[model samples]
Target: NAMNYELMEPAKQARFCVIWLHGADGHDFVDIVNYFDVSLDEIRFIFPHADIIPVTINMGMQMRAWYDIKSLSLNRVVDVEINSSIAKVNKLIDSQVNQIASENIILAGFSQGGIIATYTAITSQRKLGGIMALSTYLPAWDNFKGKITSINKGLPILVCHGTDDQVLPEVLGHDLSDKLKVSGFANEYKHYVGMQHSVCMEEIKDISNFIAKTFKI
Candidate 1:
């Protein structure tokens, strides 16, 4: 079946597009539209919801997830397939590419969705507007990618994590930023003091600024 998505069309002149994802068990369009002051006409915010499935960290409990948290098997082949075969999420992006050029789309992901977004951004063959990972880490996902420079080569990335994030932890986010720099990408890391496993208004403000200042593709 084709993936389902909710679109918030801009009211003015659509110049930019934001394609974002929700965390595990997160509502598709939950409250993300409130913080930004961008014109609805100039920006099209696309919120894509993932299908519900069993989450490994949750002991195979059913929840909405873009990919599995832990490795699935002891066999090296199986592990490889788990990461390499992420066509389900890839298709969602492919279809969107037809609607809008990749350069005009900002790929944003939160938590579990962020992991998927990070992998997609780093591995894409086409250049994108930018990458935003919220309350998430890199997962060292390059092992599965055939290429990294097409999208992430010269693009600066925004990585935000809560200092007190118990679920994913802030250190992981920091590590991702460090890893990006080591790999030759300019990654800006932001730590929300006293925040835990969630997004704050300040982070939104930063995101807004980041989006606004991005050289429009």
Candidate 2:
């Protein structure tokens, strides 16, 4: 495959699946596995690594990014690469749905991955159990608004961001939360006082608790 991926299954058969997407240039992080520290017999963690491609922000050097960032300003536009990548993740969701219902699957991502996950979940044809968008902003959000389908309306989402995050400002995250709330999504947006672009133990604990209570797998 052009892209890399890794999975960590519970000791028992997986009943709930979380399709996780990573930030730009990130690999399949095994440490998230350790941070979770949940029952190995309950959840199936799927980490999808972005394909190696030219990133405009990095002077076109090859890197793992879900999409190309055309501009660094607020008008950060996501290139067409995002569309295809989203399709790939959708296929993964489709495969999971074959074995488990849509309501049992959680779509999760961090940073750039979070951007993709938020857009994909909102525009999905099916109602995913929940969404975990950690430290990200919606690129071309204005254009993507009408794309939100009725299928995922009122979906449960957990958007966690660090207030002092310099990479992706907390303001962007808050804006996304405000928009989702206005659009009838029942999401819980948590802001930590001193977190950064990377996730922390408290965030992991919250995520773990969310998955446990929502999917029960």
Candidate 3:
């Protein structure tokens, strides 16, 4: 099965890998690879493209989405498409396990993609290095308690959001981090002031440091 994806190989032999998923628009975030100030000479960045599907929230308009948004509410119902997307993301993660150890691989996603990322991290059979959930929330989170995996029990998660984000809102991200913390997952949450529903340089700098520290480079 061929999965549409983009890869940014390291300048040297790869020691770590970061698999990033784009938001609903299916746009590639690979262009931001160079924005980080950290040394990327040995870090391979992978950008997985989501499938184009009809989003329920946008009047059934088809767009690049990991799952269908049935409502505009903060507590949206978990859609069936999420399961399929999670499977695909797991496959992508599994594919990189050969070259990069599971503990050396970091998973990241923004907005809708972030939802998928959190689900993958919680359900992943293999222990992952860390997860970056940016501007996202955990849909149907109450049910996830019983579905937590043992392998990633102590996985560190970095949850970032924009205070000015009208789409997902900062509370969602904060609440996600809090819930994960209560669920026994070591996590950290940060919200950037005056930032919108997009990544900012401050967050990028934090991400660079986070990646470097996670890989100990």
Candidate 4:
């Protein structure tokens, strides 16, 4: 399978890296690769001092996914089994951490990748600078409950979704926020009233602010 990525470096040394994951599709991995091939340049405008690593999931089809959707049942979608998928993604993140020698890493994704990013952040033993989920929903109910504990309070989670999002729905995003609160995780939730199931300029600005605030750059 093919995954795509782009990197931007600061004039000086950088201290953080964002391990970005892409969403799902049934197309070939190369097709999936073409989708995010341009995102890195856009993201660079926001966080020029850090590296952006975009990964493609080996979904066996031409497309990539964080994990295989096992079921449509609400509860089943958010179980510990989702950790298996997180584990795979985490390996990629871990590798980047080692290579960069930077503990300040952010896990970011959209849609299905967003779900997996959240799962990986919570389940990972390492400390992350933040987790950013855009136009996405939480994983299975189990992932929302007592599945994992936060390594650092105020670990900086930014979730942005549109009220008009028909794909994942707005309620699921709110549910995830509530779950994080109950589980003692600190987060920032943003809602775009008329936006659809996609990113907007405001959302990108919020993401830029989060990365800057987290790395203090």
Candidate 5:
């Protein structure tokens, strides 16, 4: 139940919440609030920092990551690491359920963080408001369908991916959306032309719209 995170208090009473996670080795994801085009005055935002762990793909270099990456393969992620992170996120979500309804809480992340967010939402017993995955793919693709919880069967999903992202190709993101859509999830896929492994203004606009729609703000 121990985890560290950055919390953004709302301008007014918080009726909704968003638990956002950063990419591997990244910590500035919370800055998105400053550039949001729409107002989210009554929404509380949480940005959890990933723990420092040795990454196998990076030759065991210790860095901030949600799980250990053994390779570029879909199943390169370690089960123990991902499960540990998911439990921590669940605890974090549990900490807020008293203040905010699970149906009004959104889970979001970028890159590696997106993978964790996606998995956590699917595996968690609670039915979350929405899921926003940016520039990421489904980790452990082969085992995903069997692990999905029934509580989140029709949970809304917004996936944003770049067509030119080399870090995690566009195909992977598309496949993620396709798989989720066919599995009964209400998914919205956004493609950014000429975009790379990062977010752009247009993508942010889409995110803002999704947030508004999800929270009815």
Candidate 6:
């Protein structure tokens, strides 16, 4: 398979769907899914009637990724490769959302996926409910300047990064948040102190709250 994605459907009719992209992991989708506690469905209470579409990107390597970040250079812009991957991911999201008869979509990702999610959400022609970037930084903005003209300013965005994240520095995450704000994007930033480069209970709670507040459901 190109990429393994799992859809967790709510029993009731869904009002929205959260398109979740995973982080960089060498393990397969099954193993990645294991990292999360599925029994904690209580988190769903925050967004009672929404469905979840978890996707994995087949990034050539055994590890799954949203985009190719193999030779990432801090000073260079990897727009071409990044944008191509975003196009495919966005297409998948669009197809899934269209089936739900709702345009209220949420783009979310962890680590590398976060980079892709942020790029796709901001550059997308269609409006999104919100975007959540967990332990990730914004991609190069130059590629989006001319290609993407309008974005739904009303869309809310939630970004959470751990202060002790070794892989991606917290400063970069904070800077990205500030840049988005300056660019006229509605967003919220949360920093977890002493935490590693991963999500925690508090972050999950915050994400739940954001979903509830944004959808008003």
User: Each model's number of backbone clashes?
Assistant: 5, 1, 0, 8, 0, 0
Which residue runs does candidate 5 get wrong by more than 4 Å? 24-27, 52-77
Which candidate would rank higher by TM-score, 4 or 6?
A: 6
- Per-candidate TM-scores read 0.79, 0.84, 0.86, 0.70, 0.86, 0.74
| TM-score ranking from best candidate downward | 5, 3, 2, 1, 6, 4
Residue pairs that clash (backbone atoms under 3 angstroms), model 2: 10-40
True lDDT of residue 124, candidate 2:
86
Model 3, span 18-48: residue lDDT tens: 9898753455577788788788888888887
Record all residue pairs in model 5 with backbone atoms less than 3 Å apart, i.e. clashing. none
Q: Give per-residue lDDT, candidate 5, residue 35.
A: 73
Best-to-worst lDDT order? 5, 3, 2, 1, 6, 4
Model 4 spans > 4 angstroms off:
1-11, 24-73, 76-80
Write candidate 4's Cα lDDT for 11-123 as tens digits: 45555667666543211122222233123322221211111222222222113222333222344222344455566666666666765432477877776667677767776
Off by over 4 Å in 3: 24-27, 52-77
Best by lDDT: 5
Model 3 residue 71 lDDT score: 29
Candidate 2 Cα outliers beyond 4 Å, as residue runs = 24-28, 52-77
**lDDT (Cα, tens digit) per residue for candidate 2, span 1-217:** 2666777777787787888887533645566767764675767877876652224322221233324332223434346356666777788888888867787788887777776777788888888888998887656666678878778887779999987776677877887788888877778999899987778789889998888778763
- Whichever of 3 and 4 has more TM-score, that candidate is 3
Question: How much is 76 displaced in model 4, in angstroms?
Answer: 4.4
Q: Please report, as a residue range, the 10-residue window in candidate 5 with the lowest summed lDDT.
A: 52-61
